[PDB]
Structure 1
Amino acid sequence: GLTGKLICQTGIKSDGDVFHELFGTRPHHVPNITPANIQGCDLHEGEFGKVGSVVIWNYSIDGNAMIAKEEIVAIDEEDKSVTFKVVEGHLFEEFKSIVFSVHVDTKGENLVTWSIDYEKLNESVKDPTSYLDFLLSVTRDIEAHHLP
């Protein structure tokens, strides 16, 4: 009853490998490129670019500042994907679990796919569609930054 998945896909005209490695090896640069959405990214544990690292995101939706501590649970070079599991923060006021994944397909003529997998604390919790608007805004800012 409490489980859902939200996905958004959009094209980018910028380099897809650079987009993938931004999230997979340089996630601390993301605040600098989309500062209206993401104000901070601090290493909590481990090292940037390694599975099992833990980062703290300081970010904002609708003017409201929030915090998500996330474990990087997967970095797949072959699939150009990175998977972030929330382990603490504002989201845990609504969800038992919530995992964000970003995948880039460069095989066609580039697609960014964000997935949100989650389990609500109860049925009155809203599905987190606002986070797709947020991830699309982040993606548009990154594309614009990486374009000549």
Structure 2
Amino acid sequence: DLSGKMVKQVEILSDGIVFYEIFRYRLYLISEMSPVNIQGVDLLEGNWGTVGSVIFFKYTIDGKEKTAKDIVEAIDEETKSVTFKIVEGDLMELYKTFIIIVQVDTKGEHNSVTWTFHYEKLKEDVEEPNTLMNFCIEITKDIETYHLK
């Protein structure tokens, strides 16, 4: 079974509405808020915050520069969810397919962000994407603590 899944939910200090705003409509702000991790988010096709938009990421993992091109496969405004499909990039040297879902819970008094990965490894030997999940969690923490009082 080359297929895998990972799920991590974290509680956040900041407004879930703003977190989803960023992930849906203003993804480029992550370069500002997590500049060690994300160097560029560049829209290639479509419009920010729409299904089918195509986005290019310049990012760094363990000090090494990587790129990905993703398509926004799905949006659910009611559940504050967005689904990214990796279509090109460094990850495709390890994974045949890779999808990342970000979903924000803005009830009740606590807000949280859940990251879900669905992937298929090219080979049985390929590592599970723990390092990427740590990355996504770090980005989350960088957003929630950006320019705090």
TM-score w.r.t. structure 1 length? 0.96
State the distance in 1 between where 2:53 and 2:147 align. 25
Which sections of structure 2, spanning at least 5 residues, go unmatched?
none
State the distance in 2 between where 1:14 and 1:123 align. 39
Matches within 5 A, 1:1-148: 1-109=1-109, 110-145=111-146, 147-148=148-149
CA contact under 8 A between 1:14 and 1:146: conserved in structure 2? no
Q: CA deviation at 1:13?
A: 1.3
SS at match of 2:72: strand
Q: CA deviation at 1:24?
A: 0.3
CA contact under 8 A between 1:8 and 1:114: conserved in structure 2? yes
How large is the Cα RMSD of the aligned pairs?
1.0
**What is the count of residue pairs matched by the alignment?**
148
Following TM superposition, the consecutive aligned residue runs of length 4 or more in structure 1 with deviations greater than 6 angstroms are none
Distance 1:41 1:100, change over 3 A: same
Which sections of structure 1, spanning at least 5 residues, go unmatched?
none
Identity of aligned residues (%): 51
State the distance in 2 between where 1:74 and 1:142 align. 22
